[PDB]
UniProtKB/TrEMBL annotation, chain C:
Manganese found in the keyword field: no
Taxonomic superkingdom: Eukaryota
SMART domains cross-referenced by the UniProt entry: IG, IGc1, IGv
Lineage: Eukaryota, Metazoa, Chordata, Craniata, Vertebrata
Major location (coarse): membrane
A GO cellular component annotation in the UniProt record: plasma membrane
Gene it is expressed from: IGL@
Organism of origin: Homo sapiens (Human)
Name of protein: IGL@ protein
Paired cysteines (S-S): 22-87, 135-194
Subcellular localization, as worded in the UniProt entry: Cell membrane; Secreted
Length: 192, 220, 212
């Protein structure tokens, strides 16, 4: 079997960072060159794996995380980073074993008048642990006090991204796919 | 489109400066403005930018903490404020519209900013009278001496811009005293000397000084 | 921190084509921008998104990008093409990066003899007990000249400040020299002279106090 990587990287719709989705890959054969040499990606950084030697390996499972972030936020999708994105939306471990691919999608997720459908969490009591997801959506309060706007000192936790087809590249939409390679005792089922 | 920037500034080390950039249209619409600086004889360097419509700015690693990019309420003017000024910050600051592909499109004329402890000094303007050696016939040269000023720069126009043909402003010379001096000359047909008035318009923004010097034929 | 590499110089004879390379890790995956910046002017976008010309830029300018090398090509160079050329890109980790820049020089330009204009001091200036003689030098090529001053006949050892030559919009050069003295020194001598030496030849202008 040939792994459903086209189903992931060419998926029609992508979720917001705070609501990042994960798909697990398994019992298949994965040709990584199909993405390793594409001029398609503006970002293709691997950790403790080396993009090239990819194919020449085996793994029990491969997990793929998908989401959309601002251009200037792609940098936060790496181990040891901090910021609204890394701390409250999606974080990578420190001993990360995988690759992070990103590509500009202005003509797809951007709009002339502006697309604000993609959001990110900017308020949260404590940050996330590697690979932790939070889709709570509960009116935030500095003192963890349950409130309801227009109440004072009560703000919604999610803020909107403003994606236009006319802003700088850094304010443009980027689709990201985080490949996480799992090495468990059970023999491999996903090799080249 | 076009971009208009604020005049040249001079600042003492440790202080701060704030430059403005205004779209010739009145608004920045839905595009992004960037800030680029260039120290004398140096290269270009991105400082940061902002997307007015989004009200969100961004900065370079190097100037993280010292720079603040903002817009006015109407969202028609962008500002760049740099703090803790140092001599190494003496440079020309440009604002520019961001291309959609990660570049810059439209550039502003640039704002010269000098950082130094030295006191700023306005210029002394003197007339360079046309030689009475040329009365009727040929052309004639007359001008203005812009002496002892600091810091750069000074612009010179003639008859308020209405006279542009045959004008030539030479780069300033930096004297050992630490002051600059430059000259501006304009070649005109000898005959007009007796039929028209000539006035050089000197502008030295750093000292908030402007001078309109009339240059007449020397009559000993 | 992403970095870009450009050669500091590039020489070319008129009408020939000049090539400027920009090096960068897999720069082909990035959208390269080229800027032209003439002496004392603001940068100008000559090529964006690898090989497109903004409306108004001659077809002589063209770029290419692939691998780890982007290239700016200027066919049939003109003296007017002299300037510094910068390549630029955006990287997710370093934001907008500029190359160190490349200076393009056009060889074999024709010789142009300098035009010298000498103005005596303005009497208004005496009012500050100062007297300045101004010697303006223009339209010469190449851009190299030495300036000497004389008083009554012998060399002048002080009060001489002269600028380095600089490019004029017509591709020739201009420079100027200032001689500062006192109203007394000025009125005392029979004459003062500015001597401009360019390419083995000299042009001298003289002004006198009585001369008016
Ligand atoms: C996405 O689809 C295109 C065909 O339009 C194909 O060339 C590319 O290889 C696909 N990418 C993946 C992840 O398979």
């Amino acid at each position: 079997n040939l792994c459903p990587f086209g189903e992931v990287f060419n998926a029609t719709k992508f979720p917001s960072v705070y609501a990042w989705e994960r798909k697990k890959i398994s019992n298949c054969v994965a040709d990584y060159s199909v993405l390793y040499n594409s001029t398609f990606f503006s970002t293709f950084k691997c950790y403790g794996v080396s993009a090239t030697k990819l194919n020449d390996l085996c793994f029990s499972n491969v997990y793929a995380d998908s989401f959309v972030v601002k251009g200037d936020d792609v940098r936060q999708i790496a181990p040891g980073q901090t910021g609204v994105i890394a701390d409250y939306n999606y974080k990578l471990p420190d001993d990360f074993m995988g690759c992070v691919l990103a590509w500009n999608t202005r003509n797809i997720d951007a709009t002339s008048t502006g697309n604000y459908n993609y959001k990110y969490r900017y308020l949260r009591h404590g940050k996330l642990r590697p690979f932790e997801r939070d889709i709570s959506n509960v009116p935030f309060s500095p003192d963890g006090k349950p409130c309801t706007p227009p109440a004072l000192n009560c703000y919604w936790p999610l803020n909107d991204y403003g994606f236009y087809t006319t802003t700088g590249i850094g304010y443009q939409p980027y689709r990201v796919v985080v490949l996480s390679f799992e090495l468990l005792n059970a023999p491999a089922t996903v090799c080249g | 489109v076009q971009l208009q920037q604020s005049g040249a500034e001079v600042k003492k080390p440790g202080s701060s400066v704030k430059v403005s950039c205004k779209a010739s249209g009145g608004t920045f619409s839905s595009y992004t403005i960037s800030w680029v600086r260039q120290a004398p004889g140096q290269g270009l360097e991105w400082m940061g930018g902002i997307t007015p419509i989004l009200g969100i700015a961004n900065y370079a690693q190097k100037f993280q903490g010292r720079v603040t990019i903002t817009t006015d309420e109407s969202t028609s003017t962008a500002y760049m404020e740099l703090s803790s000024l140092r001599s190494e910050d003496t440079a020309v600051y440009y604002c520019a519209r961001d291309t959609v592909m990660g570049g810059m499109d439209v550039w502003g004329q640039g704002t010269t900013v000098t950082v130094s402890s030295a006191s700023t000094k306005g210029p002394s303007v003197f007339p360079l009278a046309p030689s009475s050696k040329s009365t009727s016939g040929g052309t004639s040269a007359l001008g203005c001496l812009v002496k002892d000023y600091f810091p750069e720069p000074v612009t010179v126009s003639w008859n308020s811009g209405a006279l542009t043909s045959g004008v030539h402003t030479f780069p300033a010379v930096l004297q050992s005293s630490g002051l600059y001096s430059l000259s501006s000359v304009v070649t005109v047909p000898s005959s007009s000397l007796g039929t028209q008035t000539y006035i050089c318009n000197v502008n030295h923004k750093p000292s908030n000084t402007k001078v309109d010097k009339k240059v007449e034929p020397k009559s000993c | 921190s992403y970095e870009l590499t450009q050669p500091p110089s590039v020489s070319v004879a008129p009408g020939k084509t000049a090539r400027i390379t920009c090096g960068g890790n897999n720069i082909g995956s990035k959208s390269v921008h080229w800027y032209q910046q003439k002496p004392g002017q603001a940068p100008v976008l000559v090529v964006y998104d690898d090989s497109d010309r903004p409306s108004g830029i001659p077809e002589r300018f063209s770029g290419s990008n692939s691998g780890n090398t982007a290239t700016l090509t200027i066919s049939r160079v003109e003296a007017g093409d002299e300037a510094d050329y910068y390549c630029q890109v955006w990287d997710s980790s370093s934001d907008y990066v500029f190359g160190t820049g490349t200076k393009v020089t056009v060889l074999g330009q024709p010789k142009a003899n300098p035009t010298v204009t000498l103005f005596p001091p303005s009497s208004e200036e005496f009012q500050a007990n100062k007297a300045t003689l101004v010697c303006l030098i223009s339209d010469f090529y190449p851009g190299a000249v030495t300036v000497a001053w004389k008083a009554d006949g012998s060399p002048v050892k002080a009060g001489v400040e002269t600028t380095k030559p600089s490019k004029q919009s017509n591709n020739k050069y201009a420079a100027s020299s200032y001689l500062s003295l006192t109203p007394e020194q000025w009125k005392s001598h029979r004459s003062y002279s500015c001597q401009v030496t360019h390419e083995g030849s000299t042009v001298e202008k003289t002004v006198a106090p009585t001369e008016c």
